[PDB]
Design a protein around this ligand. Structure first.
Ligand code: HEM
Ligand SMILES: O=C(NCc1ccncc1)c1cn(-c2ccccc2)nc1-c1ccncc1
Length: 395
């Protein structure tokens, strides 16, 4: 019987990779698929071809926003914001933004530890079961990014609640995404006018905004940096930590090893990054030229999707790809933070968030385990991340 073109994404589950991925990688490491909008796209699933695409700027992020382009999903931001980092660089702000979001600031790591330990103490006092997403990982992500941005901790929860819509992966425009975007922009604009905001990213942007060398950088861009970096950082670190905790809980031998030898946690987090399924869709790019990728000539104007778990579970680059092995010779060569022009600017902060969160969890709850059968986790659909709605644990 005739069938329709293969549809992406394959599965919203973040606890297992579908067998189809390895089948595609072996047989058709670049092949045509249909996205949720009805558009056709090239899905790339081998390490070699994923890295080729991400290292060639003629596969353009900014052009994915063009009117009439084949789309992975609907925009939840204004089209100019797709080029956010390019706008930050053109404004002379890239070095200052990067420096502000490093985990190297004095007292930042101790703040993370204190916050993690307080969250865990509250869960222990309340008694099992505990929800490690809603009452540990996501609050830790939110508190971290309020600190990094320099904004009041009490404003975190409301900003966080915008994100279950802001990072939807939808076939159609989302009215609530515009409401939340506009409200979050007003908030960050007020922060830039708030005299008591003098630390972190927003404190630095506030100063530069009044410096004559930035006098024609737009107030809209300054506010956009705050919204985009809070939102991307919080959704990415919260979702990554949550699904890493699942992979750790399902490996009691590894859990016990990292509990016994916490100095191995950075290597453990790097493997947890490699095997992480938090990105629900391939990374989108639009070809600006005719470019050969494997056996396919991609034509100008076509959509390409870079499947991160295709690359990261490729046995030709990571032998025994499904096994967490702390002594690989190429441990940071995974694509969990992307590659090339748009490599994640928060990579160091995301690493340290997960490292400290796990260190604290294993000390407080060394017997941590799922409180429900793993198939009972509820995986969020039509979202740019894969996450369980709740993560119930005991200890
Ligand atoms: C474990 C945590 C994180 C993961 C797994 C992650 C993942 C990624 C990936 C894969 C990309 C590349 C997207 C592409 O090329 O299309 C990216 C870009 C980006 N990330 Fe992260 N990220 C994390 C944490 C953060 C944090 C903490 C921040 C900010 C505080 C952040 C802000 C951004 C921004 C703004 C971009 C866009 C860069 C550009 O367009 O050039 N991310 N991230
Ligand atoms: O969807 C978002 N990014 C993924 C994307 C993928 C392909 N094409 C466009 C965008 C996104 C959503 N928000 C947002 C935040 C608060 C309220 C409403 C929306 N911010 C961003 C964002 C973060 C960092 N850099 C740029 C954009």
């Amino acid at each position: 019987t005739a069938t329709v073109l293969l549809e992406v994404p394959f599965s919203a589950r973040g606890d297992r990779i579908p067998d189809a991925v390895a089948e595609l990688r072996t047989r058709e490491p670049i092949r045509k698929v249909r996205t949720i909008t009805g558009a056709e796209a090239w899905l790339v699933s081998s390490y070699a071809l994923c890295t080729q695409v991400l290292e060639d700027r003629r596969f353009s992020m900014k052009e994915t926003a063009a009117a009439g382009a084949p789309r992975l999903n609907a925009l939840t931001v204004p089209p100019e914001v797709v080029n956010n980092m390019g706008n930050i660089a053109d404004a002379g702000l890239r070095k200052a933004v990067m420096k502000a979001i490093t985990p190297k600031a004095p007292g930042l790591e101790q703040f993370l530890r204190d916050t993690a330990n307080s969250l865990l103490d509250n869960l222990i006092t309340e008694g099992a079961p505990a929800d490690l997403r809603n009452d540990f990982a996501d609050p830790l992500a939110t508190a971290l990014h309020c600190k990094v941005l320099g904004i009041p901790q009490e404003d975190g929860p409301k900003l966080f609640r915008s994100l279950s819509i802001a990072f939807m992966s939808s076939a159609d425009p989302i009215p609530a995404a515009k409401i939340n975007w506009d409200r979050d922009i007003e908030y960050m604009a007020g922060i830039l006018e708030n005299p008591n905001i003098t630390t972190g990213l927003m404190g630095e942007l506030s100063r530069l905004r009044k410096d004559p060398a930035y006098s024609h950088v737009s107030d809209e861009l300054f506010a956009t940096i705050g919204v985009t970096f809070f939102g991307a950082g919080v959704i990415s670190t919260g979702s990554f930590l949550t699904t890493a905790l699942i992979s750790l809980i399902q490996r009691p031998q590894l859990r016990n090893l990292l509990h016994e030898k916490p100095e191995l946690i950075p290597a453990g987090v790097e493997e947890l990054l490699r095997i992480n399924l938090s990105f629900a869709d391939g990374l989108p790019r639009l070809a600006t030229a005719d470019i050969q990728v494997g056996d396919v000539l991609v034509r100008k104007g076509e959509l390409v999707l870079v499947l991160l778990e295709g690359a990261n579970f490729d046995p030709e680059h990571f032998p025994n790809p499904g096994s967490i092995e702390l002594d690989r010779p190429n441990p940071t060569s995974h694509l969990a933070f992307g590659r090339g022009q748009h490599f994640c600017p928060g990579s160091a902060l995301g690493r340290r968030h997960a490292q400290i969160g796990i260190e604290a969890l294993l000390k407080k709850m060394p017997g941590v385990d799922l409180a429900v059968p793993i198939d009972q986790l509820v995986w969020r659909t039509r979202f740019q991340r894969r996450i369980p709605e709740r993560l119930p644990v005991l200890w």
